[PDB]
C-alpha cells in the first residue's frame, strides 16, 4: 500500500517533490534495467529535470503529455542511459523522521507503464528493474541546498512478465 524508503539525512517534510521521471541503464525475453549512477552531466542529457537536482530520480521535473515517453541517444549501446519521462508525476512524501513514503499501488502501474515502452523497444516478454559512489546507489537529492540520501532497493527490485 505505501513503500517507505529510508533516508539520510532525515529530509523535510517541505522536501517531498514529483517524481517526474527517471535514468535507467540497460545490463533473450528477459532484459534487466538498473538506476543508473551517471555522473549529474548524465543526467542533464535526458533534459526532463526542473531545478533540484537529483539522482536515479527526476523530481520536480517536466512531464509527458499523455503516456510515458522513453529516449535514448543510441539504444543498441547499453553505455548510454535511457531517460524515462513520466505523464503523471509520482508523489514522494517525506515525513521528516528520516522516511520519504511513496504510494506503492501507484509506482506499481508506474513501472508497468515503463515495462510496457521498454517492452516494445526491446522486444522481450520480460522487464525485471534490479537495485544499483554512495551518491549514485541512492535517491541522492538536493533540497535547500542540503543533500539528502535515500536507500532506493525498494524502488527498483521487481519484475514485468507480458
Ligand atoms: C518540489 O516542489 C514542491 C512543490 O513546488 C516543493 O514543496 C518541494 O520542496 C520541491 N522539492 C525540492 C527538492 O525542492
Ligand atoms: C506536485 O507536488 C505537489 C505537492 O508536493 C502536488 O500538489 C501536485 O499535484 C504535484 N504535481 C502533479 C502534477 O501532480
Do not use: M
Amino acid at each position: 500500500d505505501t513503500i517507505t524508503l529510508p533516508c539520510r539525512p532525515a529530509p523535510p517534510p517541505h522536501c517531498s517533490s514529483n517524481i517526474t521521471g527517471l535514468i535507467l541503464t540497460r545490463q533473450a525475453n528477459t532484459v534487466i534495467f538498473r538506476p543508473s549512477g551517471g555522473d549529474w552531466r548524465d543526467i542533464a542529457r535526458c533534459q526532463i529535470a526542473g531545478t533540484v537536482v537529483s539522482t536515479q530520480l527526476f523530481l520536480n521535473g517536466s512531464l509527458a503529455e499523455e503516456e510515458v515517453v522513453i529516449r535514448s541517444e543510441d539504444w543498441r549501446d547499453n553505455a548510454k542511459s535511457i531517460c524515462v519521462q513520466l505523464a503523471t508525476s509520482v508523489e514522494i512524501a517525506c515525513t521528516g523522521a528520516g522516511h520519504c513514503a511513496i504510494s506503492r499501488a501507484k509506482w506499481a502501474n508506474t513501472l508497468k507503464q515503463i515495462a510496457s515502452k521498454l517492452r516494445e523497444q526491446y522486444g522481450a516478454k520480460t522487464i525485471i528493474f534490479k537495485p544499483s559512489d554512495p551518491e549514485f546507489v541512492n535517491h541522492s537529492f538536493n533540497c535547500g541546498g542540503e543533500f539528502f540520501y535515500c536507500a532506493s532497493t525498494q524502488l527498483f527490485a521487481s519484475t514485468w512478465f507480458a
